[PDB]
Paper text:
The nap particle is an immunogenic surface adhesion complex from Mycoplasma genitalium. It is essential for motility and responsible for binding sialylated oligosaccharides on the surface of the host cell. Cryo-electron tomography (cryo-ET) of M. genitalium revealed the tetrameric organization of the nap particle complex, consisting of two P140-P110 heterodimers. The P140-P110 heterodimers form the ‘tight interface’, while the ‘loose interface’ is formed between the two heterodimers.
Here, we determined the structure of the complete native nap particle complex in-situ, including the previously uncharacterized intracellular region at 11 Å resolution using cryo-ET. In the cryo-ET reconstructions, the entire nap particle including the intracellular domain can be seen, displaying a highly electron dense and structured region (white arrow). The density of the previously unresolved intracellular region was solved at 11 Å resolution, thereby providing a model of the entire nap particle. The previously uncharacterized intracellular region appears compact proximal to the membrane and forms two distinct branches distal to the membrane. The previously uncharacterized residues 937–1053 of P110 and 1348–1444 of P140 were predicted with high confidence using Alphafold as a four-helix bundle splitting into two-helix branches. The Alphafold model could be fitted into the density of the intracellular region using rigid body docking. The transmembrane region forms a ~40-residue four-helix bundle proximal to the membrane and an unstructured flexible loop (predicted with low confidence and therefore not displayed) distal to the membrane of approximately 36 and 28 amino acids for P110 and P140, respectively. The intracellular density measures ~90 Å along the symmetry axis of the nap particle, being ~50 Å wide at the distal end, with 5 Å between the two branches. The density allows for the docking of all four intracellular helices, showing that residues from P110 are likely to form the distal branch of the intracellular density. The residues 1017–1053 of P110 and 1416–1444 of P140 were predicted with little confidence as an unstructured loop and are not displayed in this model.
Author numbering:
A (entry chain A), B (entry chain D): 953 to 1002
C (entry chain B): 1349 to 1444
D (entry chain E): 1349 to 1396
Write the structure that this text describes.
Amino acid sequence: FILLVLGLGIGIPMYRVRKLQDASFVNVFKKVDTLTTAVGSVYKKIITQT
Amino acid sequence: FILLVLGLGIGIPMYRVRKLQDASFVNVFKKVDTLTTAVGSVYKKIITQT
Amino acid sequence: WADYVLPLIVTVPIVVIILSVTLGLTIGIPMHRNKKALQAGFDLSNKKVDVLTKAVGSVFKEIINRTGISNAPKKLKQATPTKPTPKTPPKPPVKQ
Amino acid sequence: WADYVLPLIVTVPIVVIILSVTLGLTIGIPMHRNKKALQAGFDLSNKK
């Protein structure tokens, strides 16, 4: 029982950390990608208008 | 012996992950902060020159 | 020696239990802290990117306003994840 | 029942060992993968 509880007690949070980490990276990447694209759009506009 | 090996086997990498995570966040933050400051500097220059 | 078999049956499981509980606490306590640190780190990353997005947006807005290019790109607004850090609902104060 | 206490002293430690090794592998294998994922994620963040 103790080994089972220990297994679940470590196993369950380890899975949650992996999911949080993966989700968090994806979110940061998306934001950075969106910002990069936005910055690229302004560049293009500046070149086209000047 | 098995419990000791298991403890070291999980304990040692868990510490390394924490250190990597902490170091990695600090690095990303520093870069973003440097970029933000740089962008702010260009803003200031544009306002001052126009 | 050899008198000790009946207490060995008592003692061995107790040590295993103590060692298992300690191992559980030693692994378990930092895993919770790592999770929190990771979350905090990502939260901070998201905030910094948001600040960066606002800065970059401000500079563009000013450049556009000054150059007469009347069409600020709608996409900078979208980069700001307006997602509210899911505020882990504060665990209801277990009224003891 | 009979002398079943004598193999119990053989069997109990073996199960504990098997269960401990499995627990070790089940926790140990993903911990290595998490580390790698975390690193990769940060590396990618830095690149972006």
